[PDB]
Amino acid sequence: KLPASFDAREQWPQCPTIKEIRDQGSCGSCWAFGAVEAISDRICIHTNAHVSVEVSAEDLLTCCGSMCGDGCNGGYPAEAWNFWTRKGLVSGGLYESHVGCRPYSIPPCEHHVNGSRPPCTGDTPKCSKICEPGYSPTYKQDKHYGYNSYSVSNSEKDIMAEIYKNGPVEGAFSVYSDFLLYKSGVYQHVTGEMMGGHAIRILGWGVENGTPYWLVANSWNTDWGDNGFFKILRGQDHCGIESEVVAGIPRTD
Ligand SMILES: *[C@H](CS(=O)(=O)c1ccccc1)[C@H](CCc1ccccc1)NC(=O)[C@H](Cc1ccccc1)NC(=O)N1CCN(C)CC1
Given in angstroms, what resolution was this structure solved at? 1.5
Question: Residues with Cβ < 8 Å from 166, sequence gap 6 or more?
Answer: 42, 45, 247, 249
Residue 30 among the catalytic residues = yes
Q: Which residues contact 217 (CB under 8 A, 6 or more apart)?
A: 21, 22, 37, 168, 200, 201, 203, 228, 229
d(C-alpha 160, C-alpha 199), whole Å: 18
CATH code of residue 152: 3.90.70.10
Residue from 109, 120, 144, 218 carrying the catalytic annotation: 218
Rounded to whole angstroms, the Cα distance separating 89 from 248 reads 14
Work out how many domains the chain is built from and give that number: 1
What does the angle CA 7 – CA 226 – CA 165 come to, to the nearest 5 degrees?
15
Q: Which structural technique was applied? A: X-ray
Residue whose CA lies nearest to ligand 1 atom number 40:
74
Residues lining ligand 1, judged by CB closer than 6 Å? Answer: 28, 30-31, 69-70, 73-77, 172, 175, 195-199, 244
Structural domain boundaries enclosing 135: 1-253
> Residue of the nearest CA to atom 11 in ligand 1?
198
Annotate 86-97 with three-state secondary structure.
HCCECECCCCCC
